[PDB]
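Re: the multi-chain job from yesterday

Posting the exact lines I submitted so nobody has to dig through the queue logs.
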Amino acid sequence: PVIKVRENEPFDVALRRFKRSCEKAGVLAEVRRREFYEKPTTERKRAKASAVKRHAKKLARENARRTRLY
Amino acid sequence: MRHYEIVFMVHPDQSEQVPGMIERYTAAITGAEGKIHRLEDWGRRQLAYPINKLHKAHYVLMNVEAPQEVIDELETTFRFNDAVIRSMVMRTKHAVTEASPMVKAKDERRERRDDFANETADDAEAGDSEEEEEE
Amino acid sequence: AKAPIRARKRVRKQVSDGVAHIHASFNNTIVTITDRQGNALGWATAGGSGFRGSRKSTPFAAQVAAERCADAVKEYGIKNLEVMVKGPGPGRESTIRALNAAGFRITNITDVTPIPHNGCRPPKKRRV
Amino acid sequence: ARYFRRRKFCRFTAEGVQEIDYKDIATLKNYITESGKIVPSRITGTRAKYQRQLARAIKRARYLSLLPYTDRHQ
RNA sequence: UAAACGAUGUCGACUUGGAGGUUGUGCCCUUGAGGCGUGGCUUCCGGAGCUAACGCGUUAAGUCGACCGCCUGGGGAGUAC
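And the result, structure tokens for all chains:
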């Protein structure tokens, strides 16, 4: 996961962020552990869970003003 | 009928076996009041990673519509053809059998980007121009 | 300074150019120089730098491995390099900087890290 | 003026590209990097249907060597 | 068989909704995975009401309806019989 995508102008330090778009994730991340078939369905699927923090954050900006912290 | 998009590829040196089998298969399709809505040969193309040896194979895209019965004798036959390395047959839902996305790239391949060699004369004897031995 | 020497004549494989392969684990690093069509011109390791243990798998141990191997292959007669990378292990950049310090250009830092189609079940490790 | 129905850039900001066809390589590459793998749906904000039929299609295609299956073949 | 479930039986009637994910589909620079029109699962949010408390709230843990399953201190016993 130095990533095959070539960094603009070649250098000895890979620009690993700017190279990667969806690599290592799922594919080379679960190293040396017993592989389950169906566990992801209940283990991993936390999209619903992260959607709550994004709403909450968009609510609180108006509310800090209404408290006059802002 | 239900629409079955069969595409398959063939090993060059064993290819001489398939030109007799495809023309019995197209006849089993139109013999049942299904249709061949194109029958496109693409010529020989490079595999990225080898399948059943050799880094090249020869491609035929059928664009079938056919009844379910007929497709049951055919799938078992193309899968157990030695000349064929692999085949894939695609779903009825939202399925095209006309206006090929790869029609230009097929012509380009056939006309100009082919091998142009004797082992691939064996492939042009397996496309739309099929010739096969007498039994 | 310059000396008045007889003609030089020896061969090993006189390659001028190569590929390298770096198989990076959690416990060690394997760095191996090859011919372009792909045949061994030498290797080194971070355990063959004689650090032992976990210490074989740090940037500073990846570095000196890369340098171990790069010295010897001058007798095989290599002058320019490309690298193939295979692993999640440590020494990501610091092994490349050392290949560059052997006087070679390293424009191609090519990942080939093989992802099987969900291969053999790995060791369970801990009982939780 | 009324009833345009899909001129351009209308319904959705990102287009659905193909569904279930797998014989063209460039229609597939709209969701496959040069590194050789399919993109998560979270990242594009694609809608789920066009992604589900494509998963199937990209594999049909992979098994016929119309694409590289694995990163070691770059 | 169990952690057979939002630890919550079934099916059905009734009780302010907004918005997301995403789909049938009327209408729209389909300019907004959006809006409005109307269904769909799925998910955030909270009112009337209910709770020991968390928590639920139109996918109830609300108002109810009929009929079923099942419980009545712990250990020893999910075994004995």
